[PDB]
Amino acid sequence: GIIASFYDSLVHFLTWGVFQEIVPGFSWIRTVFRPSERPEGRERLAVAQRELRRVLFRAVDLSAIKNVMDFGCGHGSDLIILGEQNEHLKLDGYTISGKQAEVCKQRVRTRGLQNRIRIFQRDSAKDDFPGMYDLVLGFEVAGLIPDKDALFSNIDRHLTNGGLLIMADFVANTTFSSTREQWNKLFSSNHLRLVDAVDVSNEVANCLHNPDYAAQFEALCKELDEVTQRSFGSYENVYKALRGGLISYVLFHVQKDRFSRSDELFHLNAKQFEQLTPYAEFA
Numbered sequence: 001g002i003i004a005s006f007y008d009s010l011v012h013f014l015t016w017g018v019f020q021e022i023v024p025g026f027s028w029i030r031t032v033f034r035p036s037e038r039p040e041g042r043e044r045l046a047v048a049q050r051e052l053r054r055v056l057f058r059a060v061d062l063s064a065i066k067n068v069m070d071f072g073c074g075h076g077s078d079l080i081i082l083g084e085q086n087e088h089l090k091l092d093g094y095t096i097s098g099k100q101a102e103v104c105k106q107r108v109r110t111r112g113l114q115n116r117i118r119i120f121q122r123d124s125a126k127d128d129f130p131g132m133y134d135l136v137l138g139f140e141v142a143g144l145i146p147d148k149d150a151l152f153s154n155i156d157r158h159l160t161n162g163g164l165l166i167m168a169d170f171v172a173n174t175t176f177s178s179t180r181e182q183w184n185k186l187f188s189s190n191h192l193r194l195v196d197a198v199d200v201s202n203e204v205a206n207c208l209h210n211p212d213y214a215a216q217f218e219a220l221c222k223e224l225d226e227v228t229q230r231s232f233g234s235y236e237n238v239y240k241a242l243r244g245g246l247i248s249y250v251l252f253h254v255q256k257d258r259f260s261r262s263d264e265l266f267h268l269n270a271k272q273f274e275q276l277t278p279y280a281e282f283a
Ligand SMILES: C[S@@+](CC[C@H](N)C(=O)[O-])C[C@H]1O[C@@H](n2cnc3c(N)ncnc32)[C@H](O)[C@@H]1O
Pocket: 010, 012, 013, 014, 015, 071, 072, 073, 074, 075, 077, 094, 095, 096, 097, 100, 122, 123, 124, 125, 138, 139, 140, 141, 144, 145
Protein backbone atom coordinates (compact mmCIF):
# COMPACT_ATOMS: atom_id res chain seq x y z
CA GLY A 1 0.00 0.00 0.00
CA ILE A 2 2.22 2.80 1.28
CA ILE A 3 5.33 0.96 0.02
CA ALA A 4 4.08 0.70 -3.57
CA SER A 5 3.38 4.45 -3.85
CA PHE A 6 6.99 5.41 -3.05
CA TYR A 7 8.39 3.04 -5.68
CA ASP A 8 6.05 4.38 -8.37
CA SER A 9 7.50 7.81 -7.54
CA LEU A 10 11.09 6.70 -8.23
CA VAL A 11 9.94 5.41 -11.63
CA HIS A 12 25.79 10.60 -6.93
CA PHE A 13 23.75 8.31 -4.65
CA LEU A 14 20.12 7.37 -5.38
CA THR A 15 19.46 6.42 -1.76
CA TRP A 16 19.25 9.02 0.98
CA GLY A 17 20.74 8.27 4.31
CA VAL A 18 21.34 7.93 8.03
CA PHE A 19 20.93 11.01 10.21
CA GLN A 20 21.82 9.88 13.73
CA GLU A 21 19.89 12.92 15.01
CA ILE A 22 17.72 15.64 13.53
CA VAL A 23 19.99 18.51 12.54
CA PRO A 24 17.98 21.75 12.79
CA GLY A 25 17.74 23.70 9.56
CA PHE A 26 18.85 20.87 7.29
CA SER A 27 16.46 20.49 4.36
CA TRP A 28 16.73 17.30 2.34
CA ILE A 29 14.28 18.80 -0.16
CA ARG A 30 16.37 21.94 -0.75
CA THR A 31 19.65 20.02 -0.89
CA VAL A 32 18.39 17.57 -3.53
CA PHE A 33 17.10 20.31 -5.87
CA ARG A 34 19.48 23.30 -5.58
CA PRO A 35 22.91 21.83 -4.75
CA SER A 36 24.36 24.66 -6.84
CA GLU A 37 24.06 26.66 -3.59
CA ARG A 38 26.03 23.85 -1.91
CA PRO A 39 25.09 24.03 1.77
CA GLU A 40 26.76 22.04 4.48
CA GLY A 41 23.62 19.97 3.88
CA ARG A 42 24.96 18.91 0.48
CA GLU A 43 28.05 17.43 2.13
CA ARG A 44 25.92 16.48 5.16
CA LEU A 45 23.66 14.41 2.91
CA ALA A 46 26.72 12.78 1.32
CA VAL A 47 28.02 11.89 4.80
CA ALA A 48 24.69 10.30 5.73
CA GLN A 49 24.63 8.33 2.48
CA ARG A 50 28.11 6.94 3.13
CA GLU A 51 26.91 6.03 6.63
CA LEU A 52 23.98 4.06 5.18
CA ARG A 53 26.53 2.19 3.05
CA ARG A 54 28.84 1.60 6.04
CA VAL A 55 26.02 -0.20 7.86
CA LEU A 56 24.88 -2.08 4.72
CA PHE A 57 28.39 -3.51 4.28
CA ARG A 58 29.01 -4.07 8.01
CA ALA A 59 29.63 -7.81 7.71
CA VAL A 60 31.31 -8.01 4.27
CA ASP A 61 35.05 -8.65 3.94
CA LEU A 62 35.78 -7.29 0.47
CA SER A 63 39.31 -8.73 0.50
CA ALA A 64 37.77 -12.22 0.47
CA ILE A 65 35.29 -11.65 -2.34
CA LYS A 66 36.01 -11.82 -6.07
CA ASN A 67 32.81 -11.13 -8.07
CA VAL A 68 29.99 -8.62 -7.37
CA MET A 69 26.53 -8.23 -8.95
CA ASP A 70 24.46 -5.02 -8.56
CA PHE A 71 20.99 -5.88 -9.79
CA GLY A 72 19.74 -2.28 -9.89
CA CYS A 73 22.88 -0.24 -10.30
CA GLY A 74 21.52 3.31 -10.78
CA HIS A 75 24.35 5.67 -11.77
CA GLY A 76 27.00 3.09 -10.86
CA SER A 77 28.38 4.82 -7.74
CA ASP A 78 28.32 1.67 -5.58
CA LEU A 79 30.10 -0.41 -8.23
CA ILE A 80 32.64 2.32 -8.97
CA ILE A 81 33.45 2.94 -5.29
CA LEU A 82 33.89 -0.80 -4.71
CA GLY A 83 36.05 -1.15 -7.83
CA GLU A 84 38.21 1.88 -7.01
CA GLN A 85 38.86 0.79 -3.44
CA ASN A 86 39.35 -2.97 -4.15
CA GLU A 87 41.41 -3.54 -7.27
CA HIS A 88 40.90 -7.31 -7.32
CA LEU A 89 37.09 -7.13 -7.66
CA LYS A 90 35.12 -7.84 -10.84
CA LEU A 91 31.66 -6.24 -10.82
CA ASP A 92 28.61 -6.34 -13.10
CA GLY A 93 25.59 -4.05 -13.00
CA TYR A 94 22.08 -4.34 -14.44
CA THR A 95 19.69 -1.45 -14.90
CA ILE A 96 16.53 -1.26 -16.99
CA SER A 97 17.09 2.44 -17.77
CA GLY A 98 18.93 2.98 -21.04
CA LYS A 99 19.91 6.46 -19.85
CA GLN A 100 21.36 5.07 -16.62
CA ALA A 101 23.31 2.41 -18.56
CA GLU A 102 24.98 5.02 -20.78
CA VAL A 103 25.92 7.05 -17.70
CA CYS A 104 27.28 4.02 -15.84
CA LYS A 105 29.44 3.00 -18.81
CA GLN A 106 30.83 6.51 -19.22
CA ARG A 107 31.60 7.01 -15.53
CA VAL A 108 33.19 3.55 -15.34
CA ARG A 109 35.54 4.27 -18.23
CA THR A 110 36.36 7.81 -17.04
CA ARG A 111 37.74 6.13 -13.91
CA GLY A 112 39.62 3.46 -15.91
CA LEU A 113 37.48 0.61 -14.56
CA GLN A 114 36.14 -0.73 -17.87
CA ASN A 115 38.23 -3.88 -17.50
CA ARG A 116 36.59 -4.81 -14.19
CA ILE A 117 33.04 -3.33 -14.38
CA ARG A 118 30.45 -4.30 -17.00
CA ILE A 119 27.09 -2.53 -17.35
CA PHE A 120 24.00 -3.98 -19.02
CA GLN A 121 20.56 -2.60 -19.77
CA ARG A 122 18.80 -5.77 -18.64
CA ASP A 123 15.89 -6.80 -16.42
CA SER A 124 16.99 -8.60 -13.24
CA ALA A 125 13.73 -10.60 -13.15
CA LYS A 126 13.87 -11.57 -16.85
CA ASP A 127 17.59 -11.73 -17.78
CA ASP A 128 20.01 -14.15 -16.13
CA PHE A 129 22.88 -12.46 -14.36
CA PRO A 130 26.04 -12.90 -16.48
CA GLY A 131 28.22 -14.95 -14.15
CA MET A 132 28.62 -16.54 -10.74
CA TYR A 133 28.98 -14.07 -7.87
CA ASP A 134 30.25 -13.89 -4.30
CA LEU A 135 28.32 -10.74 -3.36
CA VAL A 136 25.00 -9.38 -4.68
CA LEU A 137 23.77 -5.81 -4.06
CA GLY A 138 20.18 -4.55 -4.17
CA PHE A 139 19.80 -1.10 -2.61
CA GLU A 140 16.18 0.02 -3.04
CA VAL A 141 15.72 -2.25 -6.07
CA ALA A 142 13.88 -5.46 -5.15
CA GLY A 143 10.90 -3.40 -3.97
CA LEU A 144 10.49 -2.09 -7.54
CA ILE A 145 10.47 -5.50 -9.26
CA PRO A 146 7.02 -7.17 -9.51
CA ASP A 147 8.22 -10.70 -10.25
CA LYS A 148 10.12 -11.28 -7.02
CA ASP A 149 10.07 -15.07 -7.49
CA ALA A 150 11.95 -14.67 -10.76
CA LEU A 151 14.31 -12.11 -9.21
CA PHE A 152 15.27 -14.31 -6.26
CA SER A 153 15.62 -17.40 -8.46
CA ASN A 154 18.05 -15.38 -10.59
CA ILE A 155 19.94 -14.36 -7.44
CA ASP A 156 20.08 -17.97 -6.19
CA ARG A 157 21.22 -19.49 -9.49
CA HIS A 158 24.10 -16.98 -9.77
CA LEU A 159 25.33 -16.85 -6.16
CA THR A 160 28.12 -19.19 -5.05
CA ASN A 161 27.16 -21.27 -2.01
CA GLY A 162 27.80 -19.23 1.09
CA GLY A 163 27.79 -16.07 -1.08
CA LEU A 164 26.33 -12.85 0.37
CA LEU A 165 23.32 -10.68 -0.54
CA ILE A 166 23.02 -7.21 0.99
CA MET A 167 19.83 -5.24 0.44
CA ALA A 168 18.20 -2.03 1.53
CA ASP A 169 14.42 -2.26 1.28
CA PHE A 170 11.12 -1.87 3.12
CA VAL A 171 9.29 -4.23 5.46
CA ALA A 172 5.57 -3.61 5.93
CA ASN A 173 4.55 -4.16 9.56
CA THR A 174 0.80 -4.71 9.06
CA THR A 175 -0.11 -9.33 -4.18
CA PHE A 176 3.35 -8.87 -2.62
CA SER A 177 2.99 -6.61 0.43
CA SER A 178 6.62 -6.68 1.67
CA THR A 179 5.72 -8.39 4.95
CA ARG A 180 8.25 -10.37 6.97
CA GLU A 181 6.52 -13.61 5.94
CA GLN A 182 6.59 -12.62 2.28
CA TRP A 183 10.30 -11.75 2.31
CA ASN A 184 10.90 -14.98 4.25
CA LYS A 185 9.13 -17.05 1.58
CA LEU A 186 11.31 -15.45 -1.11
CA PHE A 187 14.54 -16.12 0.80
CA SER A 188 13.69 -19.64 1.98
CA SER A 189 12.38 -20.87 -1.41
CA ASN A 190 15.65 -19.71 -2.99
CA HIS A 191 18.32 -21.05 -0.60
CA LEU A 192 18.80 -17.75 1.26
CA ARG A 193 19.24 -17.29 5.00
CA LEU A 194 18.74 -13.95 6.72
CA VAL A 195 21.82 -13.49 8.94
CA ASP A 196 20.81 -10.16 10.50
CA ALA A 197 19.06 -6.88 9.81
CA VAL A 198 19.50 -3.29 11.02
CA ASP A 199 16.45 -1.00 11.23
CA VAL A 200 17.41 2.54 10.23
CA SER A 201 13.80 3.79 9.98
CA ASN A 202 14.40 6.41 12.68
CA GLU A 203 17.55 7.80 11.06
CA VAL A 204 16.16 7.82 7.53
CA ALA A 205 13.13 9.70 8.90
CA ASN A 206 15.56 12.08 10.63
CA CYS A 207 17.03 12.80 7.19
CA LEU A 208 13.58 13.72 5.80
CA HIS A 209 12.59 15.78 8.86
CA ASN A 210 11.44 19.24 7.73
CA PRO A 211 9.11 21.28 9.98
CA ASP A 212 8.61 23.82 7.14
CA TYR A 213 8.33 21.26 4.32
CA ALA A 214 5.05 22.72 3.05
CA ALA A 215 6.30 26.26 2.40
CA GLN A 216 9.68 24.86 1.32
CA PHE A 217 8.17 22.56 -1.31
CA GLU A 218 5.99 25.31 -2.79
CA ALA A 219 9.01 27.58 -3.25
CA LEU A 220 10.92 24.97 -5.26
CA CYS A 221 7.74 23.92 -7.09
CA LYS A 222 7.55 27.50 -8.37
CA GLU A 223 10.59 26.81 -10.61
CA LEU A 224 9.06 23.68 -12.15
CA ASP A 225 7.43 18.35 -13.85
CA GLU A 226 4.10 17.35 -12.31
CA VAL A 227 5.21 13.71 -12.21
CA THR A 228 7.82 15.09 -9.81
CA GLN A 229 5.13 16.67 -7.59
CA ARG A 230 3.28 13.50 -6.59
CA SER A 231 6.67 11.78 -6.39
CA PHE A 232 7.76 13.95 -3.44
CA GLY A 233 4.34 13.65 -1.86
CA SER A 234 5.02 9.91 -1.83
CA TYR A 235 8.13 10.73 0.21
CA GLU A 236 6.25 12.59 2.96
CA ASN A 237 3.87 9.63 3.34
CA VAL A 238 6.96 7.49 3.86
CA TYR A 239 8.02 9.89 6.64
CA LYS A 240 4.77 9.38 8.56
CA ALA A 241 4.83 5.64 7.93
CA LEU A 242 8.40 5.41 9.23
CA ARG A 243 7.71 7.56 12.32
CA GLY A 244 4.53 5.58 12.96
CA GLY A 245 6.21 2.19 12.61
CA LEU A 246 3.89 1.19 9.78
CA ILE A 247 6.89 0.31 7.60
CA SER A 248 10.57 -0.24 8.32
CA TYR A 249 13.59 0.66 6.24
CA VAL A 250 15.79 -2.37 6.74
CA LEU A 251 19.38 -3.22 5.82
CA PHE A 252 19.46 -6.99 5.18
CA HIS A 253 22.53 -9.21 5.44
CA VAL A 254 21.73 -12.55 3.79
CA GLN A 255 23.83 -15.65 3.04
CA LYS A 256 23.24 -18.36 0.45
CA ASP A 257 22.72 -21.73 2.20
CA ARG A 258 22.37 -24.41 -0.48
CA PHE A 259 22.73 -27.41 1.86
CA SER A 260 20.02 -26.55 4.42
CA ARG A 261 16.40 -27.67 4.36
CA SER A 262 14.21 -24.90 2.98
CA ASP A 263 11.65 -25.42 5.75
CA GLU A 264 14.46 -24.90 8.24
CA LEU A 265 15.68 -21.76 6.47
CA PHE A 266 12.15 -20.41 6.90
CA HIS A 267 12.06 -21.34 10.61
CA LEU A 268 15.43 -19.66 11.25
CA ASN A 269 14.67 -16.62 9.06
CA ALA A 270 11.40 -16.06 10.93
CA LYS A 271 13.28 -15.78 14.22
CA GLN A 272 15.74 -13.31 12.66
CA PHE A 273 12.93 -11.18 11.17
CA GLU A 274 11.63 -10.61 14.72
CA GLN A 275 15.00 -9.45 16.07
CA LEU A 276 15.80 -6.49 13.82
CA THR A 277 18.50 -4.39 15.44
CA PRO A 278 17.71 -0.68 15.84
CA TYR A 279 20.50 1.49 14.45
CA ALA A 280 20.59 3.28 17.82
CA GLU A 281 21.72 -0.04 19.33
CA PHE A 282 24.29 -0.71 16.60
CA ALA A 283 28.06 -0.46 16.96
C1 LIG B 1 16.26 3.89 -6.21
S1 LIG B 1 17.30 3.35 -7.60
C2 LIG B 1 18.69 2.61 -6.71
C3 LIG B 1 19.97 2.76 -7.52
C4 LIG B 1 21.24 2.33 -6.80
N1 LIG B 1 21.06 1.00 -6.24
C5 LIG B 1 21.60 3.33 -5.72
O1 LIG B 1 21.46 3.02 -4.54
O2 LIG B 1 22.03 4.46 -5.97
C6 LIG B 1 16.47 1.90 -8.30
C7 LIG B 1 17.26 1.25 -9.44
O3 LIG B 1 16.77 -0.03 -9.78
C8 LIG B 1 16.73 -0.19 -11.19
N2 LIG B 1 15.74 -1.22 -11.55
C9 LIG B 1 14.39 -1.19 -11.28
N3 LIG B 1 13.83 -2.34 -11.73
C10 LIG B 1 14.79 -3.11 -12.29
C11 LIG B 1 14.78 -4.36 -12.89
N4 LIG B 1 13.64 -5.04 -13.01
N5 LIG B 1 15.96 -4.91 -13.37
C12 LIG B 1 17.14 -4.22 -13.24
N6 LIG B 1 17.15 -2.98 -12.64
C13 LIG B 1 16.00 -2.42 -12.17
C14 LIG B 1 16.45 1.21 -11.71
O4 LIG B 1 16.86 1.31 -13.06
C15 LIG B 1 17.28 2.04 -10.74
O5 LIG B 1 18.63 2.04 -11.18
